[PDB]
Amino acid sequence: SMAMFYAHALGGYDENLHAFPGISSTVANDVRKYSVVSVYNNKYDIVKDKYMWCYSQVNKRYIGALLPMFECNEYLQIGDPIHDQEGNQISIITYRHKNYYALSGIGYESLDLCLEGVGIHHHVLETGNAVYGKVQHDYSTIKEKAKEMNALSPGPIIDYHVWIGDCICQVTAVDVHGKEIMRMRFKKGAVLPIP
Amino acid sequence: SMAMFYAHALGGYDENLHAFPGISSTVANDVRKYSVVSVYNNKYDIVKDKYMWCYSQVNKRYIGALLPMFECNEYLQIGDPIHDQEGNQISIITYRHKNYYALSGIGYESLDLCLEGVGIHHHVLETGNAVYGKVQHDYSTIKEKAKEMNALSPGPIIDYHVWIGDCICQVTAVDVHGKEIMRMRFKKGAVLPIP
Ligand SMILES: Nc1nc(=O)c2ncn([C@@H]3O[C@H](CO)[C@@H](O)[C@H]3OP(=O)(O)OC[C@H]3O[C@@H](n4cnc5c(N)ncnc54)[C@H](O)[C@@H]3OP(=O)(O)O)c2[nH]1
Numbered sequence: 171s172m173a174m175f176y177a178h179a180l181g182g183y184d185e186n187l188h189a190f191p192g193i194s195s196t197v198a199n200d201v202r203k204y205s206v207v208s209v210y211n212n213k214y215d216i217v218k219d220k221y222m223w224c225y226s227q228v229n230k231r232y233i234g235a236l237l238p239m240f241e242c243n244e245y246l247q248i249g250d251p252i253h254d255q256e257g258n259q260i261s262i263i264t265y266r267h268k269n270y271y272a273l274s275g276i277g278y279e280s281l282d283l284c285l286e287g288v289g290i291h292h293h294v295l296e297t298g299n300a301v302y303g304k305v306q307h308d309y310s311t312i313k314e315k316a317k318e319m320n321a322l323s324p325g326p327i328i329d330y331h332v333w334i335g336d337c338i339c340q341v342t343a344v345d346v347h348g349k350e351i352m353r354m355r356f357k358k359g360a361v362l363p364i365p
Numbered sequence: 366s367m368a369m370f371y372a373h374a375l376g377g378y379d380e381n382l383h384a385f386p387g388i389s390s391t392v393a394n395d396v397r398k399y400s401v402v403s404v405y406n407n408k409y410d411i412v413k414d415k416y417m418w419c420y421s422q423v424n425k426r427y428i429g430a431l432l433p434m435f436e437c438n439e440y441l442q443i444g445d446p447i448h449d450q451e452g453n454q455i456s457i458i459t460y461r462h463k464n465y466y467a468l469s470g471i472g473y474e475s476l477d478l479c480l481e482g483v484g485i486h487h488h489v490l491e492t493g494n495a496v497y498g499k500v501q502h503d504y505s506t507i508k509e510k511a512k513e514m515n516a517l518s519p520g521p522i523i524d525y526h527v528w529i530g531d532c533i534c535q536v537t538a539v540d541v542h543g544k545e546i547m548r549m550r551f552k553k554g555a556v557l558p559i560p
């Protein structure tokens with residue numbers, strides 16, 4: 171039966187289907203393996219070694235992941251089918267950053283959250299900056315901040331912070347005092363979508 | 366002057382130094398770029414496309430990461446220097462899995478936690494299994510469990526679970542009801558150390 175893809179931005183989230191950033195689908199395509207994709211008889215190259223951090227928030231559920239992206243100067247519409255080089259539909263158009271479009275599916279490093287009670291914020295990580303909790307700065311400032319917060323007892327997580335940089339991505343969680351409760355690091359460079 | 370490396374297992378953790386699994390160091394070596402290392406003038410090959418999830422727990426702080434590993438049939442002792450091909454020390458022996466040794470430093474995807482109040486548990490992710498919260502099972506069972514828990518309101522995180530598989534690694538966090546509050550996925554296969 172035909173593979174279906176529903177755009178979350180058009181109210182298409184379905185908990186029974188596979189969940190990717192901006193997409194609920196009846197199939198689960200591993201989109202890491204594609205170097206070329208097709209949209210309406212036009213071929214586009216997947217960018218090597220830089221990705222797009224994409225996320226949707228549907229039904230108090232956060233669905234984020236590092237996705238492959240391809241360069242296309244033409245305007246493509248949300249929901250347009252994306253094909254492989256054998257005519258199979260593998261995704262739909264979702265997110266964009268200037269002339270780059272995300273290829274959503276089973277992609278790279280991902281973050282899923284239950285959004286009730288916590289907040290989430292997205293930042294561009296400036297090159298050369300280190301990250302602690304809800305702040306980013308030069309290494310020495312961050313190191314001194316971390317040592318200061320070492321005296322405090324950890325409280326419950328209230329906010330998550332996503333840091334998207336040219337060489338690395340990170341996700342931190344803080345309590346009400348700004349103490350870093352958790353840090354994950356994704357060793358890839360990426361960009362954020364532009365609405 | 367001279368790069369220093371201190372083994373956490375020998376009480377060497379220092380908050381003022383760079384922190385990696387099992388190591389506090391005065392330098393931060395990016396160990397992703399090495400394909401061969403030297404220990405006692407003998408060369409060993411870094412394993413392609415499979416890694417070791419290593420962690421130490423020091424001063425109520427969890428320091429884990431996916432690290433490169435190399436195959437060595439000889440016995441190497443914790444703290445023994447690891448060199449590159451040019452004779453420079455880049456790391457020390459830390460963790461082992463039979464004939465594989467971790468190369469600790471700035472590695473691949475990482476997880477840092479504040480251990481006060483929450484617990485952390487490590488699991489081998491069986492091939493073909495999906496993960497929800499504190500359980501791993503076939504896809505249909507996991508989807509059905511997730512939908513059941515979708516009705517519950519999320520509570521505070523009390524436990525983290527690390528899932529190390531042959532093709533993927535995941536970290537989830539659960540509340541007291543077993544509801545999944547958070548999921549990160551690392552798109553790499555790995556093994557756990559054997560004590
Ligand atoms: N979406 C997604 N992104 C990835 O980057 C990725 N990498 C691997 N996999 C695995 O592919 C198999 C299915 O193709 C699954 O074994 C999946 O393993 P898993 O990643 O271990 O998660 C178990 C399911 O459980 C899902 N859930 C998690 N929370 C919920 C929820 N509240 N309601 C409904 N479903 C939930 C979770 O999304 C998931 O199911 P879906 O594929 O249908 O999305 C991925 N899946």
Ligand SMILES: Nc1nc(=O)c2ncn([C@@H]3O[C@H](CO)[C@@H](O)[C@H]3OP(=O)(O)OC[C@H]3O[C@@H](n4cnc5c(N)ncnc54)[C@H](O)[C@@H]3OP(=O)(O)O)c2[nH]1
Nearest residue numbers: 299300301309316317320380382383384385393471472475
């Ligand atoms: N350890 C480590 N593992 C990696 O896989 C990695 N990938 C990149 N980097 C960056 O390298 C620069 C320094 O080499 C830093 O900019 C760092 O970016 P960042 O990872 O953004 O910075 C947060 C700093 O701050 C550190 N802290 C975090 N919590 C504490 C604490 N309680 N006490 C003391 N320090 C703490 C945290 O470990 C850290 O500093 P350290 O290197 O000294 O470990 C890594 N660092």
